[PDB]
Design an enzyme around this catalytic site. Sequence first.
Site, PDB file in Angstrom:
ATOM      1  CG  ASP A 113      -1.894   1.136   1.241  1.00  0.00           C
ATOM      2  OD1 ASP A 113      -2.378   1.565   0.171  1.00  0.00           O
ATOM      3  OD2 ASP A 113      -2.153   1.612   2.366  1.00  0.00           O
ATOM      4  CD  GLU A 123      -0.394  -5.531   6.832  1.00  0.00           C
ATOM      5  OE1 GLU A 123      -0.479  -5.173   5.636  1.00  0.00           O
ATOM      6  OE2 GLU A 123      -1.174  -5.120   7.734  1.00  0.00           O
ATOM      7  CE1 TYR A 126      -3.953  -1.198   9.671  1.00  0.00           C
ATOM      8  CE2 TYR A 126      -4.622   1.090   9.954  1.00  0.00           C
ATOM      9  CZ  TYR A 126      -3.658   0.162   9.611  1.00  0.00           C
ATOM     10  OH  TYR A 126      -2.431   0.637   9.193  1.00  0.00           O
ATOM     11  CD  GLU A 136       0.672  -1.083   9.450  1.00  0.00           C
ATOM     12  OE1 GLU A 136      -0.486  -1.036   8.938  1.00  0.00           O
ATOM     13  OE2 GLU A 136       1.696  -1.378   8.796  1.00  0.00           O
TER      14      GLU A 136
END
Lengths: 607, 608, 305
Positions: free
Chosen positions: A181, A425, A478, A514
Amino acid sequence: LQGGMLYPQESPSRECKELDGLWSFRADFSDNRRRGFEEQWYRRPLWESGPTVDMPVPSSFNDISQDWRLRHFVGWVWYEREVILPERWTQDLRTRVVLRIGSAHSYAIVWVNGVDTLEHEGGYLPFEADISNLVQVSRLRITIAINNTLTPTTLPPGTIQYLTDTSKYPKGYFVQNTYFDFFNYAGLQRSVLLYTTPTTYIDDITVTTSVEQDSGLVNYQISVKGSNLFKLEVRLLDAENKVVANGTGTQGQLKVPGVSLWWPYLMHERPAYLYSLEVQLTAQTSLGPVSDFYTLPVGIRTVAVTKSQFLINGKPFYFHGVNKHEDADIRGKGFDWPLLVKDFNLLRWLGANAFRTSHYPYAEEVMQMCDRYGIVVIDECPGVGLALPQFFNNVSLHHHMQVMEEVVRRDKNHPAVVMWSVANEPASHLESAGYYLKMVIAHTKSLDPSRPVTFVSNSNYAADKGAPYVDVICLNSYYSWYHDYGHLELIQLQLATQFENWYKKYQKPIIQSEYGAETIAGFHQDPPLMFTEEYQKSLLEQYHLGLDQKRRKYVVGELIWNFADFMTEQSPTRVLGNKKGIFTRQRQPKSAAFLLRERYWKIANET
Amino acid sequence: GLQGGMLYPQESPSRECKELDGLWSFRADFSDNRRRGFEEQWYRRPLWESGPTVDMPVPSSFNDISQDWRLRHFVGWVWYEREVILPERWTQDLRTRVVLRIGSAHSYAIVWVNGVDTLEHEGGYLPFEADISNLVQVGSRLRITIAINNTLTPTTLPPGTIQYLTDTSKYPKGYFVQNTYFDFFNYAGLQRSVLLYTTPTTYIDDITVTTSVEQDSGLVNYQISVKGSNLFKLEVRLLDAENKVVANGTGTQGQLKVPGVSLWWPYLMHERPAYLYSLEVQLTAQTSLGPVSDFYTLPVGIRTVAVTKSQFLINGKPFYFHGVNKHEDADIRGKGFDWPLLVKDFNLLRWLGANAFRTSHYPYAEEVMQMCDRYGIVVIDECPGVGLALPQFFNNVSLHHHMQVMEEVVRRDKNHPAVVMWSVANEPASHLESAGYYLKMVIAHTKSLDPSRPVTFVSNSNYAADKGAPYVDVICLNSYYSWYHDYGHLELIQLQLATQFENWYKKYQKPIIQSEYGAETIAGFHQDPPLMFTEEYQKSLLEQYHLGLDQKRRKYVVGELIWNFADFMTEQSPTRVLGNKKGIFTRQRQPKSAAFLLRERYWKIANE
Amino acid sequence: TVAVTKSQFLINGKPFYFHGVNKHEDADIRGKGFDWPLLVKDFNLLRWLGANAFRTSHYPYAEEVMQMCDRYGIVVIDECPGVGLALPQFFNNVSLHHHMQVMEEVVRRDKNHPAVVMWSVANEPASHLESAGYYLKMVIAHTKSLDPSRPVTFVSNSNYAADKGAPYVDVICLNSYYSWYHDYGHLELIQLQLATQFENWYKKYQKPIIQSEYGAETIAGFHQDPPLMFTEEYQKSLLEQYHLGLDQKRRKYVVGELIWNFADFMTEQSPTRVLGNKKGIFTRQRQPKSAAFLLRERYWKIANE
Ligand SMILES: *[C@@H]1O[C@H](CO)[C@@H](O[C@@H]2O[C@H](CO)[C@@H](O[C@@H]3O[C@H](CO[C@H]4O[C@H](CO[C@H]5O[C@H](CO)[C@@H](O)[C@H](O)[C@@H]5O[C@H]5O[C@H](CO)[C@@H](O)[C@H](O)[C@@H]5O)[C@@H](O)[C@H](O[C@H]5O[C@H](CO)[C@@H](O)[C@H](O)[C@@H]5O[C@H]5O[C@H](CO)[C@@H](O)[C@H](O)[C@@H]5O)[C@@H]4O)[C@@H](O)[C@H](O[C@H]4O[C@H](CO)[C@@H](O)[C@H](O)[C@@H]4O[C@@H]4O[C@@H](CO)[C@@H](O)[C@H](O)[C@@H]4O)[C@@H]3O)[C@H](O)[C@H]2NC(C)=O)[C@H](O)[C@H]1NC(C)=O
Ligand SMILES: *[C@@H]1O[C@H](CO)[C@@H](O[C@@H]2O[C@H](CO)[C@@H](O[C@@H]3O[C@H](CO[C@H]4O[C@H](CO[C@H]5O[C@H](CO)[C@@H](O)[C@H](O)[C@@H]5O[C@H]5O[C@H](CO)[C@@H](O)[C@H](O)[C@@H]5O)[C@@H](O)[C@H](O[C@H]5O[C@H](CO)[C@@H](O)[C@H](O)[C@@H]5O[C@H]5O[C@H](CO)[C@@H](O)[C@H](O)[C@@H]5O)[C@@H]4O)[C@@H](O)[C@H](O[C@H]4O[C@H](CO)[C@@H](O)[C@H](O)[C@@H]4O[C@H]4O[C@H](CO)[C@@H](O)[C@H](O)[C@@H]4O)[C@@H]3O)[C@H](O)[C@H]2NC(C)=O)[C@H](O)[C@H]1NC(C)=O
Ligand SMILES: *[C@@H]1O[C@H](CO)[C@@H](O)[C@H](O)[C@H]1NC(C)=O
Ligand SMILES: *[C@H]1O[C@H](CO)[C@@H](O)[C@H](O)[C@H]1NC(C)=O
């Protein structure tokens, strides 16, 4: 692979000539992407083979022009610079002349006066060549071709798909698929320079530091290239450049009485104390005796990990920091001094004591700043976007090990680097990925005995096949953002479950590496909705309440995603890039920045 | 400037260059009297010894780098320091001349080398240097200390005043403010590159080139100044774009004839614009340490400029400025020089179809002018004579300094083919009789320095009141109808512009450039019908100006320049939303909707 | 009941503190048009904010708004259209008679609303003029003749020493915008200049004071540190400094504070108005800027004291 990679510096025996500024540039838009090699553009000045444009260095090329085809170009780009060298360099054969390229991309080839002299695979890492032979037997012409194609064995990986339905796509259409990303910017994004040494020179230095009671111990190992008839003198200077210790030979251990330890920012009133290791080589050469000097900053400090704590200098440490990116308007990933200093001023303002180099090594100058400002670093190799099973195999494994070796070579001496991260990840639910990560981590550990190693995971706790091998568990989540959209009320429950599930299985310290929310500056709503500044604040508050329940037990860090808004590929979920920044891309705080700042100073003041 | 040449440093067989970009140590002197650094003589020792210091990037303005409230609006002395390890040959070989060159500073700058007072300069935006050979050739790292004062005064350019406010019921003890009358933030720092360079001890000090045309031939008239030894000879060669010699000569002056010349043409005036030759000067001199050679190469664009009663001629052909005003301004770095933003800006200019800019309101980095030569973007090169708003700023003392400042400007930029006109001021109080004389003399001084270009100043005066207007070769007018008066009244613009042009031309019969017009525009603000600050209002105001311009641009209007290329920073006030928002581009270099409108116009005009 | 002393505003015999806002009848598309959804939304936001009051700057509002105040408990300083009286020619016998009749209409309409606790006869008149002083004396006297039950005021931006209307008001209402309309950007001056303001006004007049306006134009989404005019950070900081100054007198003789303004609203075109007045704590579309949350916390804190 071969030799050292010390950051170049001026000294009594070494000069540096920066090649910043304008270079000549051409993208090769030929269908097979190889016309430059077919016509051998490198044999002559670049302009002779077709239209060229100016390209600044350091910079990414992607946002510099208004040519619609260049930003998303996949192929070879060609750079060229002509240099007039000091005559002393070219006539005096005791001069060794080196061309250093700070970084390139997936592949780079360098020609010097039309002669192929240097190649390198992989971005974000420096490479160099001794060009004394080509310089000393009236311009130096440097030509650099850079390939930006990502493949199943590059890091980061990608795939190339040709689409041959001629009813939906034009003849020859292909695209670059990626699974990370951030935008795959390219160019000469870091400083390019020439430097000199004597023909027998200090090639590599390795330092590790420990403590004995109140004594500092500085272990050194020095490598010399050229003549094998030489002597080494080594001094350790304090902050005011007083000699506090000295030794000799290619290796030793210096003792520093009443040592001043290197402490992170906000962990001591006088953080980041740096000594300097002055290395002096006296050698006998074919043209007489030579002297060489190199000075390496040294921070005396230790890192250890227990079942629940992350210890710096034997004292519990808590990461309260950010994730960053090398990214700014117009220059892309290009290095810039004002942005660098500004960012560090913001880190200190924020109360941040740490960042991870999401998701690739940053410019060396960034690491130098970390050593000086006391901002600890989780230094991460470009092992991001390892999403498909085809990316895990023996060839990619050995390539990943080589890259980690490069990362460690470059950064092994920075006291600010307290942990290595080998990936972000990856598809670590896969058994192939577990073995892969086991081996990259073991390789890293074998290269540097002084730091812990991890990788950052978004896997389910029960499925993660790489989790057993990390020294610290790093978790990305998230809640209410990537699932249960808008449901802020679920965050504390899901986060509690996260931590309990992970720690029950592994009994290892956890970092929340994160969390965040995409946030368009100026979007407001009450009650809060996704993309508003209020939603960002609320999501942070709920995370912070969860983190509070475990941060005095076994959660040893938190890193917000992200320091600032940055560019990504176009897609329906990316509103001109990733907007999860607490700062805008222009380095101003959104309202959430102040919320986090309060938290960080409060945590830091707990003592 | 008074003291010798000021050629832009370059590497050559006889000359090296070492840039000193990157981190410098920095401290602002916040003492009440602002003089502690001089009282304690900080320059005598490394700066850190006298107190806390911080990193400061160079080149950059200092004002936006930190989160320190008091630093951004600081008025006084700031202190910079760098330590340099020099090559042994520079210190050991006495045939080497070592020069310290500062790209620019501010109202005042003092420079110490190893604690020794060595170089001082007054005024910003202009380079200064000193021969430091003696200090480096001792028989150790060079320590360079620079103190920069950013205070503007009635005799600085730009001028300003300092006001102490002693009412302690309203202001804390010691409160003062800097008053200014110009519309851009007074950023300070080492905003341009600082370098060391070398030459031989006898060297090429100055070059002046002028160019003209005879039938099919180019004429290149050169004048060279050498300092050091008195016994020498010069060779001069002109090389074409493929590096083959087309003409050559000798001596301190002469004229090279170029058969079948390729003239330098502005962007879009010719299919292959901006043709540059190179003038290669080779010096051979006899010195105390033997013969030496010096090499310097100056780009040369063979082109002429002339002004008639209704036309601005480049190479004898009518030229129309269709361009912009700019500023040296970007996020974080302030006025700091930056390679990526420089190239980006030139790409945007060429995308726009812009063939010109004015250096509003100070000379820009030399690198910018070098790019204008290579891209064919013509330049109205303007000194920092902006904000001359008050009667007190027109003093015999101000006049001498202004004349000196123009001398520096001309010295620095005289050889750029892209520079087609000098501007000595922007919006001075030219209704004043004192201002009229002042401008008369500044302009006359400039004309005497440079015979080859026209001179102007940029005016917002009423046509009947302007006492400076008689002395300009080209009349340059700033007007903002519907914006700065008759708020919102777009319907008045064509009438008021027609009146403007008729009045000004009837009085003066000299060509006219619309040097400023526009609208403050917040990206994202939309309304129909249009209201001030919306993108639609910017578009409509531009459209109406363009229609007015069309009625005289084939007659005696010879240019139009939009204010401004991009959004930039100013002082705080209720009429400035985080600076000036009249950009057609954002400060981040992306187009507002009006940019596309102007672009279509400029390409259309270019294709006529 | 409503009564005023030399230091207190009393409702039902108990000291009251206005912690409120200024508003306008203003919304996208309909302009000043009455609208039910926007009415209910605004009252929901007033209650959420912890506002207990507003002034009808600068004209009476729809009757429906007053009915809502009565039912929701939001007290009102009911103000007539005596705004923009900036020129000497506006203070004549003809204008005075007209103003008296308008005040008659205002009182006739709203006399029975319990939420209305004070009449305001003007806003920022040129009250430094001796003619204005007499004019305001008469309009105030006329108002009291029409309604014995409520105090009367006008809202001033005059110099304390020059204000010729100030002798005649029951409560002094002051507008000031330190660091905004003067000394641009100087947040550090607010506490000092506000201390001076209150000390000077109260020494001269010895009557309760309301800070009836303060604020900063704020474009949603503009951010900077250190704070600059027009940023949300600057609005927050200006508010914080005003609040600290108010804190020094709000238990002595300052009996109210009203932020300018509840929401961004439209004005005439000019170089100081970015599509109208942007001093709202809410956007024109009734969403909070970051400063709205700061004020909310203050108002509930004060309420809970
Ligand atoms: C580098 O950067 C420096 C910092 O900016 C800069 O220095 C500044 O330069 C500006 C001018 O460019 C000066 O501004 C003028 O100041 C005039 C008054 O000057 C006198 O008073 C100053 C303040 O004194 C108080 O503070 C000092 C310092 O603490 C203290 O020592 C004094 O005792 C005073 O203390 C009281 O107040 C304190 C709080 O402020 C308090 O703590 C204390 O308890 C007391 O209550 C002072 O700074 C001046 O000192 C300078 O000059 C003397 C020589 O006279 C010299 O010994 C000093 O070293 C200083 O020297 C520097 O500056 C001078 C310039 O003055 C220069 O010549 C030197 O080379 C050196 O640089 C001095 O004692 C003030 O009158 C003037 O304002 C008038 O004029 C302007 C322009 O016309 C108008 O706009 C104004 O409205 C006003 O005039 C009006 O009109 C006139 C008619 O024409 C009149 O009729 C009207 O009524 C009305 O007055 C300017 O404001 C500024 O003072 C100075 N600041 C400092 C700190 O030095 C420096 O030049 C820069 N250098 C370079 C090379 O670039
Ligand atoms: C610098 O940048 C370059 C540009 O990006 C890099 O080169 C690219 O590398 C990519 C991999 O990273 C390659 O992508 C893979 O392609 C293969 C197919 O390869 C063959 O066909 C290619 C296309 O051929 C046409 O077009 C070219 C270009 O003009 C012409 O040359 C051909 O003549 C042909 O022309 C016809 O069509 C065009 C229209 O396009 C018309 O104009 C013409 O008229 C014709 O009609 C071709 O490019 C390939 O050529 C390469 O390989 C040759 C050896 O076989 C060699 O001779 C060539 O020199 C060239 O070598 C270069 O690239 C190879 C890698 O292939 C390197 O080894 C070498 O070092 C060179 O760099 C070749 O002819 C494709 O199979 C792959 O896709 C499969 O795999 C991926 C990954 O697993 C999957 O995701 C895909 O889904 C797919 O797998 C499935 O495939 C089917 C899906 O439908 C399915 O059936 C299966 O089940 C399967 O699972 C990749 O797409 C790319 O080809 C290459 N591009 C070019 C132009 O070279 C370069 O590597 C880089 N260098 C460095 C050092 O960094
Ligand atoms: C350190 O340096 C001194 C002075 O050169 C020397 O005498 C001594 O042997 C050195 N000490 C070591 C090598 O431990
Ligand atoms: C320049 O051209 C050649 C090369 O040096 C030489 O023969 C000739 O004399 C020169 N011409 C001059 C000085 O005009």
